[PDB]
């Protein structure tokens, strides 16, 4: 299999809208940012544009675990390191041993060592950290928290070989070794850091101080008990602040230089105004008595983000009570960068949208900049340009910050041959319809919703569009190609909404798949549903592009027609088969196209309805299967598939009907778990539209 050029670039969502739970600073060179994603990779801050740089897209689909970021950590003594502690789940869910990243042109180009157990990117308590640190005094020491009782690992030689740090005294009790906190001053440059602070998700037992290197080490006297160490920061005055949480919060502060433990929770652990973690933790590194906390989670009526200029003797939050419905906001939040960010939906008070946010577990005050400050929430990456106005009396203008961010993960997607170029259904946010590629829809489909799972238009009335959706009824029709939805009176029978949804030709029907549940056809706009007759659970339904009353299914090992509108489906006991697909598509324009897309069982096509397969000889594994205009002179739809041709991992073109292919994608661009959705553009040719898990939409184009 050769390769062509392409461009790859991401479908604009904006804003992020996933969870990032951290953003690591440089300790010594200005505007140096990093940010991590749970599932969604790595960034780096450029900040001549005010965007993020995506780092890890290089990992391929069998490698989609190391988009799961557990801790990123850069160096102060050369800023151009730069190391990553890759793997998303600790258990069986992917096969992949975690591995440390290792950078040093600050994230361009990586090596990696392989480790001997597995990292929780998208595991519990992700926001705490960074469980990776690099000795400020020499910078070929690397320490590492471990999740799974794995404790305290350490390297001597830039990351490059791990080893347990057999004499700490205690791993966890499991989400384990959380931080590591050096002590810049009990060494000189050139020498290992003798003082290491280490904080473990242990309530009878957190804090931990080694004073001999990482020898030998000894938890710290006086620590309180109960909570759990979210983060530790060692400010320039010898003071360590460490937030808690289990809700219940503290915040403590412990003198280095004496030894004494102060409380300083801004909300007494005693009151019962007490009910959250305070996880966030910020301070100013030109004034250690600057400090912030956030909550995680007040939920109602919004977060709390707590600022004190005295070392936490008093706070102020960015909001307080008035005149109840009714709170004074010494903020304000600007959205035009990601403007879905309102939910499109005004609240009435106290709460008000946009929310300061949700999941706040990082906050950052930039190190050269008290103005400047960044946080996370469960769908973007706030900050602001003038932190210190609040000091003065004014308002904190906090924007957005988390442009060239895309971390969604992307269920389903149409490229409708009228209207717009694109239109998603994806978690967390429902799906946009994307008038142009290059610019953030304002708002998603239907706010009450929560994850959009499959969407479909009618082929022939390309305007009528069915969306499917977990959150209100669960199906949402229109009839103006996205822009305006509406909900019917009824829902085909389901537990949780969800699954896909395929939409006849001339719109006149449409069969809703619900999550765990069987196929149903409403001719009724979902008034009345029926029960597709002889399908069931886990059936893969699509409907014909061009006859209306041609519906297909793959179900239990067999295939199946319908050829009532979806109404009755009869097996069309076709000799050879795969034992199971991911998903089916038939063509536009072409009558009983249908082509299956079978993971490892490879990639097949019918022409007549479903009656005959035939198995591609030429591909070994297709995940997803989509079409697009076909190639000058050529009589088919250009096909796409991602998966595997000739042991090679990618995403692949075909401009003659499958007889001969060419990969689209290169070792730079993977992008990850890509098995949900495909589709080229039927007006564009060349142009491919991929669904990713953690790198929202991205599409490529033929490069000159």
């Known amino acids: 299999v050769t390769s062509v050029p392409y461009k790859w670039d ?3 969502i904006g804003g992020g809208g996933g969870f990032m739970p951290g953003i690591v600073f440089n300790e010594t060179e200005k505007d140096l940012i990093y940010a991590r994603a749970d599932i969604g990779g790595a960034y780096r801050w450029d900040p001549s544009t005010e965007t993020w740089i995506p780092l890890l897209d290089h990992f391929q689909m069998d490698e989609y675990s190391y988009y799961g970021v557990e801790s990123i950590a850069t160096d102060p003594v050369d800023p151009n390191r730069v ?20 950078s040093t042109d600050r994230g361009e180009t990586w090596e990696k060592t392989i480790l001997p157990f597995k990292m929780g990117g998208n595991m519990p308590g992700r926001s705490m950290g960074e469980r990776l640190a690099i000795d400020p005094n ?3 020491i690397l320490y590492l928290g471990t999740r799974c009782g ?6 001597t030689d830039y990351g490059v070989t791990w080893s347990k740090v057999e004499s700490f005294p205690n791993p966890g009790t499991i989400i384990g070794v959380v931080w590591v906190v050096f002590d810049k001053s009990s060494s000189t440059p050139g020498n290992p850091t003798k003082t290491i602070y280490v904080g473990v998700a242990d309530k009878n037992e957190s804090i931990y101080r080694s004073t001999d290197g990482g020898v030998t080490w000894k938890a710290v006297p006086g620590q309180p008990k109960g909570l759990l160490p979210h983060h530790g920061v060692l400010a320039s005055n010898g003071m360590l602040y460490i937030t808690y949480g289990d809700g219940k919060g503290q915040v403590w502060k412990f003198n280095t230089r004496t030894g004494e433990w102060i409380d300083i929770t801004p909300i007494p652990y005693s009151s019962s105004d007490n009910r959250f973690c305070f996880a966030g933790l910020a301070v100013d590194r030109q004034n250690p008595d600057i400090i912030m906390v956030t909550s995680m989670n007040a939920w109602w009526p919004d977060e709390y983000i707590f600022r004190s200029t005295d070392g936490g003797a008093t706070w102020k939050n960015i909001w307080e009570w008035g005149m109840y419905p009714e709170r004074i906001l010494h903020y304000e939040i600007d959205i035009s960068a990601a403007p879905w960010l309102d939910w499109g939906t005004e609240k009435q008070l106290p709460e008000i949208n946009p929310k300061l946010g949700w999941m706040i577990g990082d906050i950052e005050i930039d190190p050269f900049n008290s103005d400047r400050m960044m946080y996370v929430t469960g769908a973007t990456i706030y900050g602001c340009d003038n932190l210190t106005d609040w000091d003065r009396g004014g308002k904190v203008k906090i924007e957005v910050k988390a442009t060239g961010i895309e971390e969604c993960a992307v269920l389903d997607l149409v490229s409708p041959p009228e209207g717009a170029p694109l239109v998603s259904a994806v978690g967390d946010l429902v799906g946009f319809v994307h008038d142009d590629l290059k610019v953030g829809p304002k708002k998603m489909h239907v706010p009450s919703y929560s994850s959009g799972t499959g969407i479909d238009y009618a082929e022939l009335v390309p305007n009528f569009m069915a969306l499917v959706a977990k959150a209100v009824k669960k199906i949402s029709f229109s009839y103006d190609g996205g822009r305006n939805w509406f909900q019917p009176p009824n829902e085909a029978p389901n537990s949780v909404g969800g699954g896909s949804v395929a939409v006849a030709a001339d719109a006149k029907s449409v069969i809703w798949t619900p999550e765990n549940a069987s196929p149903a056809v409403t001719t009724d706009n979902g008034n009345s549903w029926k029960v597709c007759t002889n399908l069931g659970m886990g059936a893969v339904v699509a409907s014909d592009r061009v006859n209306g009353k041609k519906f297909y299914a793959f179900y239990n090992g067999k295939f199946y027609i319908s050829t009532d509108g979806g ?5 069309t006991k076709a000799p050879q088969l795969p034992k199971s697909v991911n998903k089916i598509k038939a063509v536009p324009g072409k009558e009983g196209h249908v082509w299956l897309a079978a993971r490892e069982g490879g990639l097949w096509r019918s022409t007549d309805g479903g009656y005959t397969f035939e198995k591609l000889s030429n591909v070994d594994t297709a995940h997803v299967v989509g079409f697009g205009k076909a190639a000058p002179g050529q009589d088919y739809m250009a096909i796409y598939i991602t998966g595997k041709i000739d042991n090679v991992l990618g995403f692949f073109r075909s401009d ?3 007889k001969t292919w060419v990969r689209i994608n290169d070792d730079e661009h993977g992008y990850g778990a890509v098995d949900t959705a495909i589709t080229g553009d039927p007006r564009v040719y060349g142009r491919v539209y991929i669904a990713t898990n953690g790198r929202g939409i991205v599409y490529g184009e033929p490069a000159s």
């Open 656 to 658: 003659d009907a499958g």
């Open 150 to 155: 794995n404790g305290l690992w350490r390297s």
């Open 138 to 140: 020499d910078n070929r």
């Open 567 to 571: 109404l009755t489906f009869t097996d």
């Open 83 to 102: 190391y990553i502690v890759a793997g998303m789940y600790t258990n069986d869910w992917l096969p992949n041993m975690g591995a440390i990243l290792r």
């Open 10 to 12: 991401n479908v604009v």
